[PDB]
């Protein structure tokens, strides 16, 4: 509302609306649900990126100072390792976005001093931070899709097998023909009960039968004994009258 209101300042600020208004769609909201399932771990991974790139920044602060220079001829008034903040900025702005480590953004280390020292620093930086941590991020959202799908499969299986009310699977309700569907529909079905409660609330206290008054008593007591929870009219009457 307010962003629409302040868009009357002759400005673009309507245009930041649609972004999280697409959440009103179903499927995109499901996707964003997946990615937000794990965002905390993504954030602490980014903190680990911060500490690591910080920890690498010193290693050229105090040893490799004659390299981070942009090779303008006759002079370098630009050298992003003197100030520490500028070097941390340099790595976190350029070295991570290079796609290839720093090695496209340095002097050539083939000078004799500390050459192998620099090269191991480059490659271990490259390897560790880029491939392992971007892969961590990728694997997190990948596992997110897998996890939500596992949830859906799990609920569908557990709901299909059982009556939801007793703990009884469909094996007992298939000794008769087609019986699980009758059980979950004709017998206790978790929609008749809602109509029953609406009926009981919308009927006055004087005319309830003993069953209905008993159940209202139990409802106001907030005991749930009336639900069977293990025996539904047929194990009771198995041997007698099936």
């Amino acid at each position: 509302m307010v962003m629409s209101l302040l868009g009357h300042y002759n400005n673009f600020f309507f245009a930041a609306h649609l972004l999280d208004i697409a959440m009103g769609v179903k499927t995109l909201r499901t996707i964003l649900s997946s990615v937000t399932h794990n965002g905390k771990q993504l954030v602490m991974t980014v903190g680990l990126l911060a500490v690591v790139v910080y920890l690498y920044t010193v290693v050229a602060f105090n040893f490799f100072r004659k390299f981070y220079n942009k090779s303008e001829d006759e002079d370098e008034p630009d050298m992003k390792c003197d100030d520490m903040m500028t070097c941390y900025l340099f790595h976190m702005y350029v070295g991570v976005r290079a796609g290839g480590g720093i090695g496209d953004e340095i002097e050539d280390p083939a000078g004799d001093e500390y050459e192998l020292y620099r090269v191991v620093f480059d490659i271990t930086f490259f390897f560790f931070v880029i491939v392992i941590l971007l892969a961590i991020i990728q694997g997190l959202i990948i596992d997110a899709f897998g996890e939500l799908r596992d949830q859906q499969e799990q609920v569908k299986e557990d709901m299909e097998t059982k009556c939801f009310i007793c703990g009884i699977g469909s094996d007992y309700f298939d000794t008769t023909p087609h019986g699980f569907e009758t059980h979950t529909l004709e017998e206790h079905n978790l929609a008749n009960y809602m109509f029953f409660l609406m009926y009981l609330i919308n009927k006055d206290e004087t005319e309830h039968t003993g069953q209905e008054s008993y159940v209202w008593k139990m409802y106001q007591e907030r005991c749930w004994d009336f639900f069977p929870a293990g025996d539904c009219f047929r194990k009771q009457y198995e041997d007698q009258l099936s």
Binding site: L116, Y117, V119, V120, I123
Partner: peptide, 23 residues
Amino acid sequence: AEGAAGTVAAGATARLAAAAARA
């Protein structure tokens, strides 16, 4: 830990625990 003979004769302990060739 000695440039040319670095991984070999300069430090064999870490060279055996791992197998690097640039430290």
